[PDB]
């Protein structure tokens, strides 16, 4: 179609003004005196939220260049997300900040390349001086605080994960669902969702489901329908005592029938249950269970028949649980390294996922093998939907500060960073303007946070530069103090994860000279 | 549909206003203080870039006659790129440049059709004045220097690419992907492809992958289903030992199965992998293999029967490594008398290619005898793809000035040409023009990067023009000198297909006395 | 009216258009390369003309803003004019180039009203500079080339000119006029227009003229009829042997027809014409007269009869020519004290003429005391009136060179004055660059003239730039070389008035935060 064409500051003014309506929208949630974003939603209710990120999403202007602005921008929030799972609105409100300062210096006649060469500059320093501050975070007073903050300072939230990470480890897993509930809710566990095929296998009515005391596991690829499959193996384990879980496709009424009088009478005691997931998943997770219990999966594809198997290719376990949703096998006899090295092949199997729903059930199953769920209680829905946006940004920090440590929030380790790199310079004067816009706009998510309590942010941001290490401005309290004493820890990896995304997409949004776009 | 139909002057002044939108959206990102372009696009974020087709590609006007400028002297840009690889800026501006002073012409009176005949003239000389001038660039200090220059001064990816061409040699390819990580990085390998068909075979579940040590390989033509024609050879190999790799059409599930089995157990070790190809290039391709690894093809269709094979027929190597998406054969036994005998004909199979699909895919064979992939770092995606857009601009400036020597660039190369053809006359007056119209155009590219360090054009091309050989404007440092001592090399090969392909193009363009197009 | 407010950066660039249009109008008539520009005119033909002021006066734009950024610039030509006589596009070109550079900087957040400090400053020493480079001219060759260059370079325009000077001498006036002729003509001459009330007076019927040889005068501010009033005066004459000329409001019939029939027969030698002027313009006219001529006006007004009058109250002069148009006294027996007393009155008189039109009929008295005409020639009327614009202009300059000396033209002389000035700085920051604004701006009128040859300006002014003293570029003949010696002169007011005024609008313009006009 046919093109409009802008040139020079033309094109830079309207991509700006885009950029600030995307940033203005997310800014007003930043910190804890932070308000709330609407966003319509065709299908039914409207959502409210904090999370900067989701606010970002919606936003797309009319005015074709605008648009852009936004749309290019809106990648920082967007990336920050994916990276991090904290620190979107701060990611935003740098960017904006770089963005508009570099403007106005492309505008004073310095060239944007260079520019771009000194913020490139500054970040990668500054992405250093903030390893050197951060200190690690492991004891669990120091997770449920940045849990807390995360949270935007609710204490049951960040009590709940910490108490959830202590219960899991660290090669575990935790989720977050939807609570019936009006409170929060946490639950711990291999388990898998389905349940007995044959109601009358119930051997404790107490419970309502069959408890299997140490008993031998069968995993069948294909699905039971005919007795005579199962008659080789049935036999070896009638013969041995020992009770016997099938997990097969499906087990069929014929072959059902049978196993039910088997058990109803004592003649051997049999469970039998679906197999978990559908299609080449199935295949791959009923294998994750022949190595924790250290059996074989019979394959009719591979070639092996139902009948052809022994005790020999069982599995094994302490003790079996399931009821009419859930099967769980507590603790199989698999050997640890085969355990361990199929965990290190799943492992890197999600590093392959270039899809996102790929990577989320391959960590369930590693979860399975080396797990939580944590649900959130509120009133209404429109309620749930903001908790539950809180709650998982709250975790994701929460594993960010494991793994990366802490710094002082209320934005003053970046305040701090700036300080630090006063005397950077570049190769020319162009680069060096270059690095004071960047190091000018590590002030902004202390400012803004003062902003959003309606006080001056000038005064509190010199008030703040004037003292030193974790000396803050604490925004709920409204007065100042160390804040690693009062709790507001940021995960470094956001905090830097937030400057690298702005940076990167600032620094080239103010190299444009022309833009090109459809006409309206 | 009814047309609008438009002559001389009229349509000369639209075709004009058309080729300077496109041209002026490209010339802003000539040279190191070139800017860059923003092109939006439907699906997802827009795109920042440098490169100068990429701009060209997109341009469409409203005004069908000014499309029609615009889509002509698209070409110049477009074929530019698919010559040379670089150079499509500069391509653009020197047709603008030679369109705009012919045109001038033409309105002077003077006879188009001899306008062309000097400008075309004047050209076939600076080629051949540029082959005078270029020097030989095979060093790798001067390669890098080359790759350099084409990423924008980015001294990372000349050093990258230099290391890169030193280490798969000439006979040898490289390619670029996006990388995973934050910083770019370099790995160099015979390999193709395809994944193991079994993923029950990999033997080493660290990397989730297949290394086979030290094995047998069979090359079957044919497609296997049984696992009888196996036997005589599986059978060989089971009391000799080594491990064995069985390339063929397929290994249907029959014969698949069993296979799966017998390494399952510890019987033989053996992996199973589609052939490489479709058709007679897959023929090609098994028998390339063949020659690296001392054994036979077991063609089905020139007498051989699978059975019939024994350890005397299978390849063998030092190792091999098999993943769900590629198979690498590591070190073959095949001697090198038989491989660069099968070299030098393949080398000879590319001669006699007509078609450019013919050479991509046999050059690929040669370096798979005689492969390198460069990994581009960046923190976003709007970051990569910048980045990877002068990666490849570079890769194939290097691979150009390898092949044709290099240039002192700055666009002096050009300015020192027209110097040279200042006594060149035509048949007539009109011709006379014609030369001096595509001698001034030369200056262009020079005058453009000089403008867009905001410097007066006139006085640095003046100041160029004044001096000998390689002195030229290093629009980097804003200071004069010897440009191949500043290591600022264009390689001759881009230089010379810019003005031939701006010359082709903007030569028919001044003949226009009459456009025809639709109504709106 | 309701009223349009706009603010900062928008009400200034709107400010600048404005500006844009109307200088980008007369600086298309600078210097000898300087093309014409057509004015429309409402009632009948329209005008051609170079005058840069007469471009200025009628441009008049449609945005309010835009408009008010011409109206105020406008300004800066329109008092050149009022100063000088010459030099109005070029004050108009530094105007422009100060106010586009100083707003460039005001848009970078230095603070306006030290740049108009820098400037100012800068401003006040070159005007200094300037009178040390100034060299006299007084020598007729230096004058007709000053003329010359004003008139566009023609030659005969600076020799008429010359001729005029040297003939009125420095105290006497030149005018010019539409000649009937097609070639340029000069006259030379106390005389006013009015001719003889009595054709029957003529003494001398070769030239039909009255040739009164040294003759009284009488003064009569009221108008007579009756003869009776004269008896007593015309005695005293007809006993004294000397003619009479009488110069009253009027002469009617019967004091008319009486004073016919004694000049018939001899008795008195009588004139009689009627007074120059109407009202009190009359009366202060025929005032100077009688200062002239050492006699008394005779005003009835002021308590006098016209018969109580003697030969004590009548004029004398040498001789006296009067015919059917004209009358002149040629050598008055006034003395030279009560004139030059007289006519310093009369010179201050035109000093507090607020009034153009004031100001016109006074110093046309003053050179009746203190005179020349050129007749400008011409074909049709359209070239009378380009022709004569440029009369009068080197008229002025020539004027302007003989009271304050000559530069080197050519735009040099700002020029030098300029790198005379690089060391000059300010109390801050801001005023520096609104020094170096100004300086950059001396430039523009050497770049300008240059420009209107189509040669590269930059070119050029490095090329003056480098040289000493008088060098300088000829746009006419297109080298370079001693603008003295190549007679290219600007006189020193012309300049140094340009540079002042223009400073002084721009300067305050610079200043423009807010612009209030009224709604379309
Ligand atoms: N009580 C507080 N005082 C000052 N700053 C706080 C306080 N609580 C939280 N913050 C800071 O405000 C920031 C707000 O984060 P939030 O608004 O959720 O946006 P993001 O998407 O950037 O996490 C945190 O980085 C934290 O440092
Ligand atoms: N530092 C420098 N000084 C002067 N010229 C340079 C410098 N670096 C690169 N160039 C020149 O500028 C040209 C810019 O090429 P580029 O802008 O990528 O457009 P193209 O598509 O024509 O390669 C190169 O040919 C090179 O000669
Ligand atoms: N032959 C020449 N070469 C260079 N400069 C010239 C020549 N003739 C005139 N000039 C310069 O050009 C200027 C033109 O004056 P003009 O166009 O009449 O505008 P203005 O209203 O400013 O006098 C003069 O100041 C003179 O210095
Ligand atoms: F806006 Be963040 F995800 F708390
Ligand atoms: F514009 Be080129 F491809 F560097
Ligand atoms: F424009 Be000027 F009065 F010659
Ligand atoms: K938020
Ligand atoms: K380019
Ligand atoms: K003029
Ligand atoms: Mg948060
Ligand atoms: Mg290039
Ligand atoms: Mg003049």
Chains 1, 2, 3 share one sequence.
Do not use: W
Request: net charge negative.
């Amino acid at each position: 179609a046919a093109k409009d064409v802008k040139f020079g500051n033309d094109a830079r003014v309207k991509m700006l003004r885009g950029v600030n309506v995307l940033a203005d929208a997310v800014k007003v949630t930043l910190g804890p005196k932070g308000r709330n974003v609407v966003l319509d939603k065709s299908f039914g209710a409207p959502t409210i939220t904090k999370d900067g990120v989701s606010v970002a999403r919606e936003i797309e202007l009319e005015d074709k260049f605008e648009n852009m602005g936004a749309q290019m921008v809106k990648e920082v929030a967007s990336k920050a997300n994916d990276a991090a799972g904290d620190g979107t609105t701060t990611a935003t409100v740098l960017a904006q900040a770089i963005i508009t300062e570099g403007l106005k210096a492309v505008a004073c006649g310095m060239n944007p390349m260079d520019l771009k060469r000194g913020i490139d500059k500054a970040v990668t320093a500054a992405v250093e001086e903030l390893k050197a501050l951060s200190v690690p975070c492991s004891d669990s007073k120091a997770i449920a605080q940045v849990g807390t903050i995360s949270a935007n300072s609710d204490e049951t939230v960040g009590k709940l994960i910490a108490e959830a990470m202590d219960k899991v480890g660290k090669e575990g897993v935790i989720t977050v669902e939807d609570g019936t509930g009006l409170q929060d809710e946490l639950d711990v566990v291999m388990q898998f969702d389905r349940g007995y095929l044959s109601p009358y296998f119930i051997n404790k009515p107490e419970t309502g489901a069959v408890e299997l005391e140490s008993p031998f596991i069968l995993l069948a690829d294909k699905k039971i329908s005919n007795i005579r499959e199962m008659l080789p193996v049935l036999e070896a384990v009638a013969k041995a005592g020992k009770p016997l879980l099938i997990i097969a496709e499906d087990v069929e009424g014929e072959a059902l029938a049978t196993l039910v009088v088997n058990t109803m009478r004592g003649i051997v005691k049999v469970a039998a249950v679906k197999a978990p997931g559908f299609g080449d998943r199935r295949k791959a997770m009923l294998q994750d269970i022949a190595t924790l219990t250290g059996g074989t999966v019979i394959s009719e594809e591979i070639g092996m028949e139902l009948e052809k198997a022994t005790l020999e290719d069982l599995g094994q376990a302490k003790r079996v649980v399931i009821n009419k949703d859930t099967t769980t096998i507590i603790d199989g006899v698999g050997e640890e390294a085969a355990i361990q090295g199929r965990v290190a092949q799943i492992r890197q199997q999600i590093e392959e996922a270039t899809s996102d729903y790929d990577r989320e059930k391959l960590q369930e199953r590693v979860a399975k093998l080396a797990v939580a769920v944590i649900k959130v209680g509120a009133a209404t829905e429109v309620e749930m939907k903001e908790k539950k946006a809180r709650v998982e940004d709250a975790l994701h920090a929460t594993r960010a500060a494991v793994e990366e440590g802490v710094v002082a929030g209320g934005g003053v380790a970046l305040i701090r960073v700036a300080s630090k790199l006063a005397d950077l310079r570049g190769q020319n004067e162009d680069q060096n303007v270059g690095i004071k816009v960047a190091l000018r706009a590590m002030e902004a998510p202390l400012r803004q946070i003062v902003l959003n309590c309606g006080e001056e942010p000038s005064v509190v941001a010199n008030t703040v530069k004037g003292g030193d290490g974790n000396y803050g401005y604490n925004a709920a309290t409204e007065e100042y103090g160390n804040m690693i004493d009062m709790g507001i820890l940021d995960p470094t990896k956001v905090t830097r994860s937030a400057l690298q995304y702005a940076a990167s997409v600032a620094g080239l949004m103010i190299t444009t000279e022309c833009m090109v776009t459809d006409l309206p």
